[PDB]
């Protein structure tokens, strides 16, 4: 007789135990399975329930979260699943394309379960705390009604009714680290070749970095209402300066493909007639 639902977790990798763990601690009925069953044993000595199959698992719960290692494993895992899910509620937190988490909507909307998409931004050690966000998408009356059971995990963020939006927010956040990753690399590549220590300028570069957040959130608002101003100075002045920066990589011998994509959209910018406005007009030019 426990005030909280009960819950099935299907994958107990790292961050399914992290999850079906959190769960656990919280008081909730929590029935576990793994393709390994051997994973469940630290599981079910925590307090949970073990299950033979995903059949077994779905069976003893309403609530019913989705850990495994892709998108592949979770098409085995539910496509092996033989009883009704109709009035239950699906929340996947598998990695995943936008397109497959709405298909994976389509696929619990014809067997009548509600469907929520999420993502996870930390590591499994920091479930349960304020160190892991998790981000979803799908129908918002499932949302607003699981929650509370869904803060359990970490800082919960809602994004809309098209289920694959928890997909697109999490490639693009990371693809732009990565944009930031690479540049910083070829940021070292240029000031090896002048020779400063790049441990030393690494942790100049970061304090640098730091500063930037106010200024995206600026950008983000000039491109969303069209008022374009000359944030970093105005073109004209900032394509000056990027001749001056491919000139000086260059003649190092390093790389200059961004450098150079950037210099061609302000001069197009300048040509165009906006050479008053600044850096993040050139947004529309890409799109």
Request: proline residues 3%.
């Amino acid at each position: 007789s426990l005030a909280a639902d009960p819950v099935t977790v299907l994958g107990l990798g790292d961050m399914g135990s992290a999850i079906a763990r959190a769960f656990v601690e919280r008081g909730h009925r929590t029935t576990v399975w793994n393709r390994t069953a051997s994973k469940c044993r630290p599981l079910v000595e925590a307090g949970a329930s073990a299950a033979a199959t995903p059949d077994e698992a779905v069976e003893a719960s309403r609530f019913v979260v989705v850990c495994l290692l892709d998108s592949a494993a979770v098409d085995e895992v539910l496509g092996s699943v033989t009883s009704s899910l109709a009035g239950k509620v699906l929340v996947n937190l598998t990695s995943g394309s936008p397109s497959q988490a709405r298909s994976n909507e389509r696929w619990a909307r014809e067997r009548g379960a509600e469907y929520l998409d999420g993502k996870i931004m930390g590591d499994p050690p920091d479930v349960g705390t304020s160190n892991v966000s998790l981000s979803f998408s799908g129908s918002r009356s499932a949302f607003d009604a699981h929650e509370p059971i869904l803060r359990e995990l970490g800082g919960v963020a809602y994004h809309g009714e098209d289920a694959g939006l928890a997909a697109v927010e999490f490639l693009a956040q990371v693809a732009m680290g990565y944009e930031l990753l690479i540049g910083f690399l070829h940021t070292l590549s240029v000031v090896h070749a002048e020779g400063v220590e790049v441990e030393a300028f690494a942790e100049r570069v970061a304090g640098s970095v730091a500063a930037y957040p106010p200024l995206l959130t600026m950008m983000g608002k000039a491109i969303g209402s069209g008022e374009y101003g000359p944030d970093l100075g105005s073109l004209r002045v900032q394509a000056a300066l990027m001749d001056d920066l491919i000139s000086h990589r260059e003649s190092l011998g390093v790389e200059a493909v961004r450098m150079r994509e950037v210099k061609e959209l302000m001069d197009q910018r300048i040509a165009d007639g906006h050479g008053g406005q600044g850096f993040s007009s050139l947004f529309e030019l890409l799109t």
